[PDB]
Amino acid sequence: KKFACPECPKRFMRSDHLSKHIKTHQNKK
Ligand SMILES: [Zn+2]
């Protein structure tokens, strides 16, 4: 699939890993 992180320009053909990647992207403030 055509995945794309809204926080970075990097992309991953998989979505499972995108969960851990996008997770760290956000923080609890
Ligand atoms: Zn990202």
From Swiss-Prot:
Transmembrane segments: none annotated. A zinc finger (C2H2-type) spans 3-25. Induction: By insulin. It is found in: Nucleus; Cytoplasm. Glycans are attached at residues 15, 19. It comes from the Eukaryota. Up-regulated in adenocarcinomas of the stomach (at protein level). Isoform 3 is ubiquitously expressed at low levels. The modification N6-acetyllysine is found at residue 20. Signal peptide: none annotated. The modification Phosphoserine is found at residues 15, 19. Phosphorylated on multiple serine and threonine residues. Phosphorylation is coupled to ubiquitination, sumoylation and proteolytic processing. Also implicated in the repression of RECK by ERBB2. Acetylated. Acetylation/deacetylation events affect transcriptional activity. Deacetylation leads to an increase in the expression of the 12(s)-lipooxygenase gene through recruitment of p300 to the promoter. Deacetylated by HDAC6 which leads to increased expression of ENG and positive regulation of angiogenesis. Interacts with ATF7IP, ATF7IP2, BAHD1, POGZ, HCFC1, AATF and PHC2. Interacts with HLTF; the interaction may be required for basal transcriptional activity of HLTF. Interacts (deacetylated form) with EP300; the interaction enhances gene expression. Interacts with HDAC1 and JUN. Interacts with ELF1; the interaction is inhibited by glycosylation of SP1. Interaction with NFYA; the interaction is inhibited by glycosylation of SP1. Interacts with ATF7IP and TBP. Interacts with MEIS2 isoform 4 and PBX1 isoform PBX1a. Interacts with EGR1. Interacts with SMARCA4/BRG1. The 9aaTAD motif is a transactivation domain present in a large number of yeast and animal transcription factors. In the hepatoma cell line Hep-G2, SP1 precursor mRNA may undergo homotype trans-splicing leading to the duplication of exons 2 and 3. Belongs to the Sp1 C2H2-type zinc-finger protein family. Transcription factor that can activate or repress transcription in response to physiological and pathological stimuli. Binds with high affinity to GC-rich motifs and regulates the expression of a large number of genes involved in a variety of processes such as cell growth, apoptosis, differentiation and immune responses. Highly regulated by post-translational modifications (phosphorylations, sumoylation, proteolytic cleavage, glycosylation and acetylation). Also binds the PDGFR-alpha G-box promoter. May have a role in modulating the cellular response to DNA damage. This is Transcription factor Sp1. It comes from Homo sapiens. The lineage of its organism: Eukaryota, Metazoa, Chordata, Craniata, Vertebrata. The gene is SP1. The chain holds residues 684 to 712 of 785 of the full protein.
